Amino acid sequence: LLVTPPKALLKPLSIPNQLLLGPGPSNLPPRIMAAGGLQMIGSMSKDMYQIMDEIKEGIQYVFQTRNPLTLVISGSGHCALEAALVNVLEPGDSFLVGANGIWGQRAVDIGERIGARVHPMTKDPGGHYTLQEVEEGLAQHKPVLLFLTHGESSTGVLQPLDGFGELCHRYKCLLLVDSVASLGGTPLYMDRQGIDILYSGSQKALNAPPGTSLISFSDKAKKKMYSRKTKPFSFYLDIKWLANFWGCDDQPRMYHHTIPVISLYSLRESLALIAEQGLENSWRQHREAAAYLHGRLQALGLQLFVKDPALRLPTVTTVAVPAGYDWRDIVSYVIDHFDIEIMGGLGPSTGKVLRIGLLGCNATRENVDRVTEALRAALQHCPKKK
Amino acid sequence: LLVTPPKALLKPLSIPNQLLLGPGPSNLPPRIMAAGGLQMIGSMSKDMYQIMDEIKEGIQYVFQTRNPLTLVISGSGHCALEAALVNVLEPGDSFLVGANGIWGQRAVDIGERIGARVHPMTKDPGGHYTLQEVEEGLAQHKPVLLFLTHGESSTGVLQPLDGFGELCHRYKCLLLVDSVASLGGTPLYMDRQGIDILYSGSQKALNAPPGTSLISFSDKAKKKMYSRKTKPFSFYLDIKWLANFWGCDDQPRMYHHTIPVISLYSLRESLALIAEQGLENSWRQHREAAAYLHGRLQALGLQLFVKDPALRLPTVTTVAVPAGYDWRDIVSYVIDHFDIEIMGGLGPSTGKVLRIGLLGCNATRENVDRVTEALRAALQHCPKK
Numbered sequence A: 001l002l003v004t005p006p007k008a009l010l011k012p013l014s015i016p017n018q019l020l021l022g023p024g025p026s027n028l029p030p031r032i033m034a035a036g037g038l039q040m041i042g043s044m045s046k047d048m049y050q051i052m053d054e055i056k057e058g059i060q061y062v063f064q065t066r067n068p069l070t071l072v073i074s075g076s077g078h079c080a081l082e083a084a085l086v087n088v089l090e091p092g093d094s095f096l097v098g099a100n101g102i103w104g105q106r107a108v109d110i111g112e113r114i115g116a117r118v119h120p121m122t123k124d125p126g127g128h129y130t131l132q133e134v135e136e137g138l139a140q141h142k143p144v145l146l147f148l149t150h151g152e153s154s155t156g157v158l159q160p161l162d163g164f165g166e167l168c169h170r171y172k173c174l175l176l177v178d179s180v181a182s183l184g185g186t187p188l189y190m191d192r193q194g195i196d197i198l199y200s201g202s203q204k205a206l207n208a209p210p211g212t213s214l215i216s217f218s219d220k221a222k223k224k225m226y227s228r229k230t231k232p233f234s235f236y237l238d239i240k241w242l243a244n245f246w247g248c249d250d251q252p253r254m255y256h257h258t259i260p261v262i263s264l265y266s267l268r269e270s271l272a273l274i275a276e277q278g279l280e281n282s283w284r285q286h287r288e289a290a291a292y293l294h295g296r297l298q299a300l301g302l303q304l305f306v307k308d309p310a311l312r313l314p315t316v317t318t319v320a321v322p323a324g325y326d327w328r329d330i331v332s333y334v335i336d337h338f339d340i341e342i343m344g345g346l347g348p349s350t351g352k353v354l355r356i357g358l359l360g361c362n363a364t365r366e367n368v369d370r371v372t373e374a375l376r377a378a379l380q381h382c383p384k385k386k
Numbered sequence B: 001l002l003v004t005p006p007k008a009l010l011k012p013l014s015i016p017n018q019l020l021l022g023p024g025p026s027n028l029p030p031r032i033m034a035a036g037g038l039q040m041i042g043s044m045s046k047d048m049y050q051i052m053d054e055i056k057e058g059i060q061y062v063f064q065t066r067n068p069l070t071l072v073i074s075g076s077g078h079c080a081l082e083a084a085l086v087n088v089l090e091p092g093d094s095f096l097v098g099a100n101g102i103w104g105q106r107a108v109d110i111g112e113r114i115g116a117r118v119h120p121m122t123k124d125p126g127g128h129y130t131l132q133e134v135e136e137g138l139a140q141h142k143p144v145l146l147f148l149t150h151g152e153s154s155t156g157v158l159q160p161l162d163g164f165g166e167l168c169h170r171y172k173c174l175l176l177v178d179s180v181a182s183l184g185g186t187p188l189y190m191d192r193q194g195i196d197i198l199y200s201g202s203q204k205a206l207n208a209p210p211g212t213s214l215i216s217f218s219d220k221a222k223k224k225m226y227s228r229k230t231k232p233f234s235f236y237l238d239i240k241w242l243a244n245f246w247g248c249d250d251q252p253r254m255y256h257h258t259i260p261v262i263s264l265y266s267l268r269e270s271l272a273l274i275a276e277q278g279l280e281n282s283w284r285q286h287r288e289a290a291a292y293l294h295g296r297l298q299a300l301g302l303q304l305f306v307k308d309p310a311l312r313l314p315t316v317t318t319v320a321v322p323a324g325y326d327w328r329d330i331v332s333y334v335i336d337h338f339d340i341e342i343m344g345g346l347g348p349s350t351g352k353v354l355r356i357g358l359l360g361c362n363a364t365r366e367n368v369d370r371v372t373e374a375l376r377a378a379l380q381h382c383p384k385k
Ligand SMILES: *Cc1c(COP(=O)(O)O)cnc(C)c1O
Pocket: A023, A024, A076, A077, A078, A079, A103, A149, A151, A152, A153, A178, A179, A180, A181, A182, A201, A210, A211, B256, B257, B258
């Protein structure tokens, strides 16, 4: 045998106990861990289809939509974004992008790759879009689709959504919203707000393991995806196939790809947990936990990166890196000494911020206090330039 | 609020006990279940990178490769196939496909979608490709890439691989092989056999949960993917990003997408298990379990769909549907009365076969006895036209 058994693999798997207070992934509550330890069932079994049906109802609840074209993407949040774009956008389609952070930037990248005519509305980290800014782009660029990040987890910004769907429809444009970091943590009403494509991820406020994502499409979006004269560049993400297998159309469920059965157990449990809590209660929990964190951070002498409180994302808080410190020193101090994960910035916000997440079961006073004391220590014991 | 908490979600999760003896997914051994119940760690933590590095070594062992561009794809077997094609193939590229079952048909579909000029070598289910046939395709079509299914789990066929790599390389063609169903169950030597892109999946003989897949690229494949004139149509599957995050290039890892941490625990344990068993021992187990199954099926009067034993895929056996029965009756009887899943056909083998999987820890004479007993009962209780 060219390759002999790797000796590292003959040792038991061991993992450290880490408090994940970054922008994701989040820690798992006991019920979600327990679901992930269950035995397999047939991936096209009646029982699996029931679990899928229940997850669909759970997505319809947390998104606040009655869209029948609602399902799980078998991939991370990026995969759901790519699924939205590859199905909705044909080569040459005008695509307007709220490029105010890494997520808009990734939407630009995907749009470019799949041949769309991409028109970024570029903003610096911390920026957000007004209706007038969006209408100017809608008027100048005549897009079939607008992408807006709801929770800009790379900058800590909460993008208002009211009226954007209506405005987009007046220009015959579809509204696609990224709610990966916002879902569960802040108000979101898919149908009410006129959103045509809404997606989120498993590992943020829902506290499920990463690797699955949630997506829903309005009838307007469905029409565009089913009317195109080219096939999408992806088979794995082809919505006609996925809609069928997820029981959204008029035909028997056909084999497309094997869904991640065990991850669906855990995703289903994560949707049950928030259905038990109640959406509005969850919003309150995150709203109150973030207010408390904001106070404790400012009492340390730290400056919140988003200056307008109304624009602050409860689930991911950006903090200006204090003068004289290497943000990497602070972040490593906190994990190295306290087994607490926080993060620096990402894309445009790199070097400029620290990012602290309050996600689902982790959005608690106790965790605010732990991260507050960790930063207090890091500020006292990290090197500060002379 | 428009939508109230779903009543069904307020009930507790409850799963039936099923013995999964179809072509996959397979049942999970204790260590893999235990790993699935663990707590999260940072998706970009040093400890996560260690686990990933160990997984990479494990893939290099089960594939028998030293290729540094070896990693996990964050999606099912299909996703690994798509990752291979969207990175290797550029619009206009000639793509020669072994369409002898569903998996070649799927490769055709992906290739068409991404603008390749696709050349299927279409073969009836149960067929396999000779060196002569492929060279005729290489002669005619001058492809940049050949797709061949190793373990054709829709037809039960074990495709010979020796000599195909050397042949493709003479014709400056890359060899892409699907080993989702063969990995761990039958001999496979990526580097020895000159395979340029090799992929498998988590939920076949490895007995990990479905949702991840395994992929490796040779230096020749890397050269193609890294000298494209256009970016791949996929960002999620762009190999330059993926190679970097998986520590395969000479740059520090940068965030691409969040890897499925818990699934990686489980895959790690699945690779540890087969590392503990030994590849050749795994091949032995599957070979002997399949031989036992073939004899028991034949004793029932059932006919094996692949007649040459040398061409039978140990991990997924095709049985010709017995004359006079509705195969759906048999499949239903087996789950309803014996809590065993088997399958009918898929793609070209639809309606023509039953499919019985023998996968990893499930590949046992006990399970052969269980499915044989259940089939015996189905043949005498299912109505016969
Ligand atoms: C975390 C995140 C993503 C990316 O999700 P992945 O699971 O890493 O692919 C996308 N958008 C937002 C707002 C996010 O917070």
